[PDB]
């Protein structure tokens, strides 16, 4: 079980770890998060009590290095940093643990929620969407724009999600205009799956990462990417059975996890109505359709 | 964005544009079968592609063979329209290609956009104008060429005849829309008005009669009165009560 120690908590802040969160008071003796499950990516995220615009976080995997958080009073945020000195780090963690100044990652043993949300998400794929090659962890915030949003302004601070555009040459083969526009199977299977993602696992990993960035940071471009990737599958007449069954599981856990109160901003009426009721795959997402109908019937 | 009353003069500027109307592409007669079911029989249709500035009409005849063994024909008709418009643009020299295509029906926007991805600088636009281009098939010579076609065929017309020798494209377009609006509301009466003097003939190379400027003013009057008469007969409204502000507004409104 890995640990992300904090140097200190000089400013009052809501700290998130994956789907959990807790309030820390200005100069509270908080020295970090222990018992973090190995085997998955994690996201530690922040919302300053004095300024809710300040909403940001770090994707990391504790198998890749020893990471800690330290407040930077100049840039005015909690920064992730890597500790290179193994022995210094082990000794820091041991002290804070002995003094019980660490919150425990509060995983219920029955609870597969985080695994279910991150099943296909891999740090190496995150690091290609979020380019900052000197760090092993990835910074995301509420205001970072996607490469696609920037085409329609700082390239270095962008989310490099795969551009999906239903009305692009990429999506539409010359001479198959109506066929490719009405049945996106070519775009899904040849361009995206075989061509760009190489397999359904990478496609689902980006889909899951987009959802999580949408939910944890209210990142609008991430929400757009998550909906495009769902719509591209639901608008394809020809999808491998395993992908449809897996999509239903993926979406079910995403809808299950979404805060009830954020449904209005994070869910696109047109895409969900189309995907559940109109699309080729309208009868292929039983779990997702049941949770959406029971949780969010107004949207539909 | 959308073409409306506000930006109407833009039709007559020197940026090449085409209207595309797909109403007469997919045409059927509905009939009873022997077993008492209903069936359709397709007839020849046409794409109505018009340069509102020049009067140049690219009448692409849609032969019933297009539809053979195809499903969801009203949907296919949009995509076939978009294919034929894109093939027309591609066939034109670069300096004759339109900068804008205005579709008369919003269901044409996606089909045309997807067929024109090779032309990202051609703006595909809807219009808020209620244009009477469906009545194109009430112009005898246009109806005849469509009905006689035995294969796909493009036929080129000037829908303004020689009017641009005497009037502006603004006035030519208003005259054309008033004629088509009349033909659409009461074809019989509209045509009777256009032939009421057998001395004024239609030249072999024209669609409309050779009216003098004075006769055009009279004809335009009779067309407006017909649109008003029919609007009266439709809504059970006493038209002899109406004002000139009330009146103008129901050809406008229409
Ligand atoms: O329908 S036409 O082809 N053109 C419009 C029209 C109607 C009456 C006069 O012009 C036509 C009909 C009847 C006699 C000659 C024609 F040119």
């Amino acid at each position: 079980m890995n640990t992300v120690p904090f140097t200190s908590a000089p400013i009052e802040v809501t700290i998130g770890i994956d789907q959990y969160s807790f309030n820390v008071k200005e100069n509270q003796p908080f020295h970090g998060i222990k018992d973090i499950p190995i085997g998955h990516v994690h996201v530690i995220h922040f919302q300053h009590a004095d300024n809710s615009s300040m909403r940001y976080g770090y994707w990391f995997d504790c198998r890749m290095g020893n990471f800690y958080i330290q407040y930077d009073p100049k840039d005015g945020l909690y920064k992730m940093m890597e500790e290179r000195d193994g022995a210094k780090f082990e000794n820091i963690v041991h002290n804070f643990k002995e003094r019980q100044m660490m919150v425990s990652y509060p995983k219920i043993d029955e609870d597969d929620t985080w695994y279910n949300l991150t099943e296909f998400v891999q740090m190496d794929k995150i690091r290609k969407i979020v380019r900052k090659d000197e760090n092993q962890f990835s910074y995301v915030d509420s205001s970072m724009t996607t490469v696609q949003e920037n085409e329609l302004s700082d390239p270095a601070h962008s989310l490099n999600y795969t551009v999906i555009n239903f009305k692009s040459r990429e999506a539409i083969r010359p001479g198959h205009e109506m066929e490719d526009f009405l049945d996106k199977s070519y775009y899904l299977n040849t361009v995206m799956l075989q061509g760009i993602f190489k397999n359904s696992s990478n496609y689902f990993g980006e889909l899951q990462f987009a959802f999580l960035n949408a939910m944890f940071f209210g990142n609008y471009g991430s929400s757009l990417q998550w909906h495009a990737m769902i719509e591209l599958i639901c608008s394809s007449a020809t999808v491998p059975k395993h992908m449809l069954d897996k999509l239903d599981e993926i979406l079910y856990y995403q809808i299950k996890t979404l805060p009830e109160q954020y449904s209005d901003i994070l869910l696109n009426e047109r895409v969900w109505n189309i995907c559940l009721y109109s699309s080729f795959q309208k009868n292929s997402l039983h779990n997702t359709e049941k949770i959406m109908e029971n949780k969010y019937p107004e949207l539909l | 964005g959308a073409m409306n009353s506000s930006n109407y003069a833009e039709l007559f500027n020197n940026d090449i544009k085409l209207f595309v109307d797909d109403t007469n592409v997919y045409r059927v007669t509905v009939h009873k079968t022997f077993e008492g079911n209903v069936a359709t029989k397709a007839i020849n249709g046409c794409i109505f592609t018009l340069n509102p500035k020049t009067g140049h009409l690219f009448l692409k005849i849609i032969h019933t063979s297009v539809w053979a063994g195809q499903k969801r024909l009203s949907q296919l008709a949009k995509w076939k329209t978009a294919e034929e418009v894109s093939a027309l643009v591609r066939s034109l020299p670069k300096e004759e290609q339109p900068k804008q295509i205005i579709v008369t029906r919003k269901a044409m926007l996606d089909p045309l956009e997807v067929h024109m991805l090779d032309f990202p600088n051609i703006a595909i636009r809807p219009t808020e104008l209620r244009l009477p281009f469906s009545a194109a098939m009430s112009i005898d010579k246009l109806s005849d060429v469509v009905m006689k076609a035995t294969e796909p065929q493009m036929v080129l017309f000037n829908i303004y005849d020689d009017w641009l020798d005497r009037i502006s494209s603004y006035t030519a377009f208003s005259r054309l829309t008033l004629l088509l609006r009349a033909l659409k509301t009461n074809e019989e009466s509209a045509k009777m008005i256009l032939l009421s003097d057998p001395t004024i003939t239609i030249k072999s190379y024209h669609l409309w009669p050779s009216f003098t400027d004075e006769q055009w003013i009279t004809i335009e009057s009779q067309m407006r009165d017909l649109i008003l008469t029919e609007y009266g007969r439709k809504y059970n409204v006493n038209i002899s009560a109406l004002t000139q502000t009330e009146i103008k507004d129901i050809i406008l409104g229409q």
Side-chain angles (χ1 to χ4, degrees), chain A residues 1-151 154-300, chain B:
Chain A
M1 302 307 267
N2 284 113
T3 297
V4 169
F6 280 50
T7 300
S8 66
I11 69 159
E12 189 165 308
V13 63
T14 307
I15 306 189
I17 174 70
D18 297 346
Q19 75 269 39
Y20 310 105
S21 76
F22 55 90
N23 299 309
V24 169
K25 302 288 172 286
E26 178 193 319
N27 297 309
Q28 186 178 328
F30 173 82
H31 294 286
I33 308 171
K34 59 177 201 196
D35 308 327
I36 299 169
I38 310 173
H40 316 289
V41 304
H42 294 290
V43 58
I44 280 163
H45 45 104
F46 301 91
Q47 192 152 42
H48 295 186
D50 81 351
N51 182 175
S52 305
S53 80
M54 224 71 166
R55 181 117 91 128
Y56 63 94
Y58 307 88
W59 291 94
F60 65 94
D61 181 335
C62 284
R63 291 175 295 190
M64 287 167 67
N66 298 315
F67 305 116
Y68 65 106
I69 300 286
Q70 183 159 114
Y71 183 73
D72 174 8
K74 191 176 155 67
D75 290 344
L77 79 188
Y78 287 106
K79 296 190 156 164
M80 182 160 285
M81 294 191 278
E82 186 171 351
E83 183 50 81
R84 305 313 322 225
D85 185 354
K88 186 179 175 176
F89 187 80
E90 289 161 10
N91 185 235
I92 288 298
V93 169
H94 176 268
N95 177 96
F96 286 149
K97 281 198 184 177
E98 278 297 335
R99 299 221 292 143
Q100 299 198 36
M101 301 267 101
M102 296 201 179
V103 287
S104 175
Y105 185 96
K107 202 196 160 301
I108 301 325
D109 299 304
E110 173 208 32
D111 208 319
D112 263 350
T113 295
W114 192 243
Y115 171 73
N116 288 331
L117 293 168
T118 61
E119 180 171 1
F120 301 99
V121 179
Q122 300 285 28
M123 260 317 306
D124 67 295
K125 294 317 202 303
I126 290 175
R127 290 184 79 245
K128 292 179 196 306
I129 295 159
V130 189
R131 317 207 142 288
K132 202 159 199 292
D133 292 336
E134 65 268 32
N135 303 323
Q136 298 291 306
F137 51 79
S138 298
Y139 172 86
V140 181
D141 71 25
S142 43
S143 59
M144 279 163 61
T145 55
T146 70
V147 169
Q148 175 170 70
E149 283 176 309
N150 292 339
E151 293 175 336
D154 179 32
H157 221 255
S158 277
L159 293 167
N160 306 266
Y161 290 124
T162 297
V163 180
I164 298 173
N165 177 1
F166 296 139
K167 302 200 278 187
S168 63
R169 180 47 65 226
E170 291 72 21
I172 310 291
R173 290 172 292 176
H176 309 244
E177 285 86 359
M178 183 180 182
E179 162 190 24
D180 285 353
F181 188 67
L182 288 182
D183 176 9
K184 309 212 190 278
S185 292
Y186 146 76
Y187 192 36
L188 174 64
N189 297 304
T190 303
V191 182
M192 288 285 160
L193 282 178
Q194 298 158 208
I196 299 183
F197 287 101
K198 307 318 189 173
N199 58 58
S200 64
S201 296
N202 295 331
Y203 182 98
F204 286 143
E206 180 166 327
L207 185 158
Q208 289 183 314
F209 183 53
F211 171 77
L212 288 173
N213 284 324
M215 174 169 71
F216 289 131
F217 307 114
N219 187 271
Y220 178 70
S222 293
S223 182
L224 288 183
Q225 180 70 6
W226 176 55
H227 285 96
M229 296 190 78
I230 294 172
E231 200 177 347
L232 173 56
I233 291 174
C234 297
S235 297
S236 293
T238 308
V239 185
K241 311 92 173 61
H242 76 275
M243 267 189 78
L244 291 172
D245 290 329
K246 189 59 63 151
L247 179 60
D248 195 26
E249 293 307 305
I250 288 168
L251 290 184
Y252 171 84
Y253 289 108
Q254 290 171 338
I255 297 307
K256 184 178 178 51
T257 304
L258 266 179
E260 294 75 43
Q261 305 288 354
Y262 290 45
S263 73
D264 62 313
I265 63 175
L266 290 171
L267 291 186
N268 185 283
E269 186 173 289
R270 180 193 62 88
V271 166
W272 282 96
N273 280 286
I274 277 41
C275 292
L276 295 187
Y277 300 124
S278 275
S279 77
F280 291 109
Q281 304 308 342
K282 63 202 175 299
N283 285 331
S284 308
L285 310 176
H286 300 110
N287 297 356
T288 292
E289 187 168 298
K290 196 171 295 319
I291 190 168
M292 279 287 295
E293 290 192 351
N294 278 283
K295 190 163 188 224
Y296 296 123
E298 336 79 37
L299 194 89
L300 312 172
Chain B
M3 202 274 282
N4 58 38
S5 338
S6 313
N7 57 25
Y8 183 81
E10 189 180 4
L11 298 178
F12 314 118
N13 77 3
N14 283 78
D15 288 352
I16 300 174
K17 41 183 75 65
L18 298 176
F19 278 113
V20 168
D21 180 85
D22 69 314
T23 307
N24 285 311
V25 168
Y26 176 44
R27 296 208 283 170
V28 294
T29 62
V30 185
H31 61 86
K32 284 288 195 68
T33 69
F34 181 80
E35 298 83 12
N37 305 124
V38 177
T40 57
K41 191 193 151 299
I43 63 169
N44 290 346
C46 60
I47 310 163
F48 181 100
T49 298
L50 173 63
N51 189 328
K53 177 87 160 150
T54 61
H56 288 201
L57 173 61
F58 301 87
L59 198 72
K60 176 69 192 224
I61 303 178
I62 307 299
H63 188 261
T64 57
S65 54
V66 165
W67 313 129
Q70 300 295 322
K71 282 105 181 72
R72 298 186 53 70
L73 296 183
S74 52
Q75 170 193 259
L76 178 61
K78 296 180 214 305
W79 293 86
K80 174 58 173 194
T81 301
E83 187 188 349
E84 288 300 341
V85 167
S86 59
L88 168 62
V89 175
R90 278 175 227 271
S91 76
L92 289 167
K94 190 172 215 209
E95 67 272 12
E96 294 177 35
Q97 290 176 345
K99 292 141 202 134
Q100 297 179 10
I101 304 169
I102 309 156
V103 300
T104 61
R105 307 201 298 170
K106 287 181 221 73
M108 278 303 305
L109 291 162
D110 279 346
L112 191 51
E113 291 185 30
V114 165
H115 271 282
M116 298 292 286
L117 290 166
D118 287 343
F119 298 97
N121 301 317
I122 303 178
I124 305 298
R125 303 178 60 212
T127 184
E128 290 307 337
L129 301 185
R130 226 267 258 81
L131 297 157
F133 297 145
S134 60
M137 285 304 86
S138 281
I139 298 167
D140 291 320
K141 276 172 195 201
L142 300 191
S143 194
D144 286 347
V145 74
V146 169
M147 270 57 156
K148 295 194 223 312
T150 58
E151 45 182 323
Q153 191 184 349
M154 166 77 85
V155 186
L156 303 183
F157 293 95
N158 193 318
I159 204 156
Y160 297 157
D161 292 342
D162 63 346
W163 307 340
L164 296 184
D165 293 352
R166 298 192 63 82
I167 62 179
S168 65
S169 61
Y170 180 111
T171 306
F173 192 74
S174 307
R175 180 179 291 160
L176 172 66
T177 59
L178 171 65
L179 288 169
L180 288 175
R181 181 58 65 201
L183 285 162
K184 195 172 167 153
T185 56
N186 201 310
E187 180 175 13
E188 180 207 336
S189 306
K191 294 185 171 181
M192 280 301 268
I193 287 157
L194 287 167
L195 334 179
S196 96
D197 189 342
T199 72
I200 312 158
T201 58
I202 303 179
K203 292 301 151 299
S204 54
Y205 48 86
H206 282 170
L207 299 174
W208 316 100
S210 302
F211 292 126
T212 61
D213 304 357
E214 297 315 298
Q215 289 166 336
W216 264 128
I217 296 297
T218 300
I219 290 285
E220 285 166 348
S221 323
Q222 296 179 336
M223 290 301 188
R224 277 189 306 266
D225 189 0
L226 175 169
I227 291 152
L228 196 68
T229 285
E230 282 310 318
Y231 173 97
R233 280 168 22 160
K234 187 184 214 77
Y235 292 99
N236 288 320
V237 161
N238 196 344
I239 58 139
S240 63
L242 305 174
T243 63
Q244 292 305 303
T245 328
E246 274 174 330
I247 286 172
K248 164 97 207 222
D249 293 4
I250 329 188
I251 302 99
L252 234 218
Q254 250 176 104

Coordinates of all heavy atoms in Angstrom, one line a residue, chain B residues 136-144 161 179 183 187 190-196 200-203 206-209 211 216 223, ligand 1:
Chain B
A136 N -41.4 24.9 -59.5 CA -40.6 24.8 -60.7 C -41.3 23.8 -61.6 O -41.2 24.0 -62.8 CB -39.2 24.3 -60.4
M137 N -41.9 22.8 -61.1 CA -42.6 21.7 -61.9 C -43.9 22.2 -62.5 O -44.5 21.5 -63.3 CB -42.7 20.4 -61.2 CG -41.3 19.7 -61.1 SD -40.5 19.3 -62.6 CE -39.5 20.8 -62.9
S138 N -44.3 23.4 -62.2 CA -45.5 24.1 -62.9 C -45.0 25.0 -64.0 O -45.9 25.7 -64.6 CB -46.2 25.0 -61.9 OG -47.1 24.2 -61.1
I139 N -43.7 25.0 -64.3 CA -43.2 25.7 -65.6 C -43.1 24.6 -66.7 O -42.3 23.7 -66.6 CB -41.8 26.4 -65.3 CG1 -41.9 27.5 -64.3 CG2 -41.3 26.9 -66.7 CD1 -40.6 28.0 -63.8
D140 N -44.0 24.8 -67.6 CA -44.3 23.8 -68.7 C -43.0 23.1 -69.2 O -42.9 21.9 -69.1 CB -45.2 24.3 -69.7 CG -46.6 24.7 -69.2 OD1 -47.1 23.8 -68.4 OD2 -47.2 25.7 -69.6
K141 N -42.1 23.9 -69.7 CA -40.9 23.5 -70.4 C -40.0 22.7 -69.4 O -39.4 21.7 -69.9 CB -40.1 24.6 -71.1 CG -40.7 25.0 -72.5 CD -40.1 26.2 -73.0 CE -40.8 26.8 -74.2 NZ -40.0 27.7 -75.1
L142 N -40.0 23.0 -68.1 CA -39.2 22.3 -67.1 C -39.8 21.0 -66.8 O -39.1 20.0 -66.9 CB -39.0 23.2 -65.8 CG -38.4 24.5 -66.0 CD1 -38.1 25.1 -64.6 CD2 -37.1 24.5 -66.8
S143 N -41.1 21.0 -66.5 CA -41.9 19.7 -66.3 C -41.8 18.7 -67.5 O -41.6 17.5 -67.2 CB -43.4 20.1 -66.2 OG -44.1 19.0 -65.7
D144 N -41.8 19.3 -68.7 CA -41.7 18.4 -70.0 C -40.4 17.7 -70.1 O -40.4 16.5 -70.3 CB -42.0 19.2 -71.3 CG -43.4 19.6 -71.5 OD1 -44.3 19.1 -70.8 OD2 -43.7 20.6 -72.3
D161 N -35.2 34.4 -68.4 CA -35.2 34.7 -69.8 C -34.2 35.8 -70.1 O -33.1 35.7 -69.7 CB -36.7 35.0 -70.3 CG -37.6 33.9 -70.2 OD1 -37.2 32.7 -70.2 OD2 -38.9 34.1 -70.3
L179 N -44.0 35.0 -59.3 CA -44.6 34.0 -60.3 C -44.7 32.7 -59.7 O -45.7 32.0 -59.8 CB -43.7 34.0 -61.5 CG -43.8 35.3 -62.4 CD1 -42.7 35.2 -63.4 CD2 -45.1 35.4 -63.0
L183 N -48.1 30.4 -58.9 CA -48.2 29.0 -59.5 C -48.4 28.0 -58.4 O -49.2 27.0 -58.6 CB -46.9 28.7 -60.4 CG -46.9 29.5 -61.7 CD1 -45.4 29.4 -62.2 CD2 -47.8 28.8 -62.7
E187 N -52.2 27.3 -59.6 CA -51.5 27.0 -60.8 C -52.4 27.4 -62.0 O -52.0 28.1 -62.9 CB -51.1 25.5 -60.9 CG -50.4 25.2 -62.2 CD -49.9 23.8 -62.2 OE1 -50.3 23.0 -61.4 OE2 -49.1 23.5 -63.1
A190 N -52.9 31.2 -62.2 CA -51.6 31.8 -62.5 C -51.3 31.7 -64.0 O -50.9 32.7 -64.6 CB -50.5 31.1 -61.7
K191 N -51.4 30.5 -64.6 CA -51.1 30.2 -66.0 C -52.1 31.0 -66.9 O -51.7 31.6 -67.9 CB -51.2 28.7 -66.3 CG -50.1 27.9 -65.6 CD -50.0 26.5 -65.9 CE -48.8 25.8 -65.4 NZ -48.7 24.4 -65.7
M192 N -53.4 31.0 -66.5 CA -54.5 31.7 -67.2 C -54.1 33.2 -67.3 O -54.2 33.8 -68.4 CB -55.8 31.6 -66.5 CG -56.5 30.3 -66.9 SD -56.8 30.1 -68.6 CE -58.5 30.7 -68.7
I193 N -53.6 33.8 -66.2 CA -53.1 35.2 -66.2 C -52.0 35.4 -67.2 O -51.9 36.5 -67.9 CB -52.7 35.6 -64.8 CG1 -53.9 35.8 -63.9 CG2 -51.8 36.8 -64.8 CD1 -53.6 35.7 -62.4
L194 N -51.1 34.4 -67.3 CA -49.8 34.5 -68.1 C -50.2 34.4 -69.6 O -49.3 34.8 -70.4 CB -48.8 33.4 -67.7 CG -48.2 33.7 -66.3 CD1 -47.5 32.4 -65.8 CD2 -47.2 34.8 -66.4
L195 N -51.3 33.8 -70.0 CA -51.7 33.5 -71.4 C -53.0 34.3 -71.7 O -53.4 34.2 -72.9 CB -52.0 32.0 -71.5 CG -51.2 31.1 -70.6 CD1 -51.5 29.7 -70.8 CD2 -49.7 31.3 -70.7
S196 N -53.5 35.1 -70.8 CA -54.8 35.9 -71.0 C -54.8 36.7 -72.3 O -55.9 36.9 -72.9 CB -55.2 36.7 -69.8 OG -54.7 38.0 -70.0
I200 N -49.2 38.0 -76.9 CA -47.9 37.9 -76.2 C -47.5 36.5 -76.0 O -48.1 35.7 -75.3 CB -47.9 38.6 -74.8 CG1 -48.6 40.0 -74.8 CG2 -46.5 38.7 -74.2 CD1 -49.2 40.5 -73.5
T201 N -46.5 36.0 -76.8 CA -46.1 34.6 -76.8 C -44.9 34.4 -76.0 O -44.2 35.4 -75.5 CB -45.8 34.1 -78.3 OG1 -44.8 34.9 -78.8 CG2 -47.0 34.1 -79.2
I202 N -44.6 33.1 -75.7 CA -43.3 32.6 -75.1 C -42.3 32.2 -76.3 O -42.7 31.3 -77.0 CB -43.5 31.4 -74.2 CG1 -44.5 31.8 -73.0 CG2 -42.2 30.9 -73.6 CD1 -44.8 30.7 -72.1
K203 N -41.2 32.9 -76.3 CA -40.2 32.5 -77.4 C -39.7 31.1 -77.1 O -39.8 30.6 -75.9 CB -39.0 33.5 -77.3 CG -39.3 35.0 -77.7 CD -39.8 35.2 -79.1 CE -40.7 36.4 -79.3 NZ -41.9 36.3 -78.5
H206 N -37.3 30.6 -74.3 CA -37.7 31.3 -73.0 C -38.7 30.4 -72.3 O -39.2 29.4 -72.9 CB -38.3 32.7 -73.3 CG -37.3 33.7 -73.5 ND1 -37.7 35.0 -74.0 CD2 -36.0 33.8 -73.4 CE1 -36.7 35.7 -74.1 NE2 -35.6 35.0 -73.8
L207 N -38.9 30.7 -71.0 CA -39.9 29.9 -70.2 C -41.2 30.7 -70.0 O -42.3 30.1 -69.8 CB -39.2 29.6 -68.8 CG -37.9 28.8 -68.9 CD1 -37.2 28.7 -67.5 CD2 -38.1 27.4 -69.4
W208 N -41.0 32.0 -70.0 CA -42.1 33.0 -69.7 C -42.5 33.8 -71.0 O -41.7 33.8 -71.9 CB -41.7 33.9 -68.6 CG -41.1 33.3 -67.4 CD1 -39.7 33.2 -67.2 CD2 -41.7 32.6 -66.3 NE1 -39.5 32.6 -66.0 CE2 -40.7 32.2 -65.4 CE3 -43.0 32.3 -65.9 CZ2 -40.9 31.5 -64.2 CZ3 -43.3 31.7 -64.8 CH2 -42.2 31.3 -63.9
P209 N -43.6 34.5 -71.0 CA -44.0 35.3 -72.1 C -43.2 36.6 -72.3 O -42.6 37.0 -71.3 CB -45.5 35.7 -71.8 CG -45.9 34.7 -70.7 CD -44.7 34.4 -70.0
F211 N -43.4 39.8 -72.2 CA -44.2 41.0 -71.7 C -43.3 42.2 -71.8 O -42.1 42.1 -71.4 CB -44.6 40.8 -70.3 CG -45.7 39.8 -70.1 CD1 -45.5 38.7 -69.2 CD2 -46.9 39.8 -70.8 CE1 -46.5 37.8 -69.0 CE2 -47.8 38.9 -70.6 CZ -47.6 37.8 -69.7
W216 N -45.6 43.7 -67.7 CA -45.0 43.0 -66.5 C -45.6 43.5 -65.2 O -46.1 42.8 -64.4 CB -43.5 43.0 -66.5 CG -42.9 41.8 -67.2 CD1 -42.0 41.7 -68.2 CD2 -43.1 40.4 -66.8 NE1 -41.6 40.4 -68.4 CE2 -42.4 39.6 -67.6 CE3 -44.0 39.8 -65.8 CZ2 -42.4 38.2 -67.5 CZ3 -44.0 38.4 -65.7 CH2 -43.2 37.6 -66.6
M223 N -50.9 38.7 -60.3 CA -50.3 37.6 -59.5 C -50.5 37.9 -58.0 O -50.9 37.0 -57.3 CB -48.8 37.4 -59.8 CG -48.6 36.8 -61.2 SD -49.5 35.2 -61.4 CE -48.9 34.7 -63.0
Ligands
LIG1 O1 -45.4 26.8 -68.1 S1 -44.6 27.3 -69.2 O2 -43.6 26.4 -69.7 N1 -43.9 28.6 -68.6 C1 -44.6 29.5 -67.7 C2 -45.8 29.9 -68.3 C3 -47.1 29.6 -68.2 C4 -47.9 30.4 -69.1 C5 -47.0 31.2 -69.7 O3 -45.7 30.9 -69.2 C6 -45.8 27.7 -70.5 C7 -47.1 27.4 -70.3 C8 -48.0 27.7 -71.3 C9 -47.6 28.2 -72.5 C10 -46.3 28.6 -72.7 C11 -45.4 28.3 -71.6 F1 -44.1 28.7 -71.8

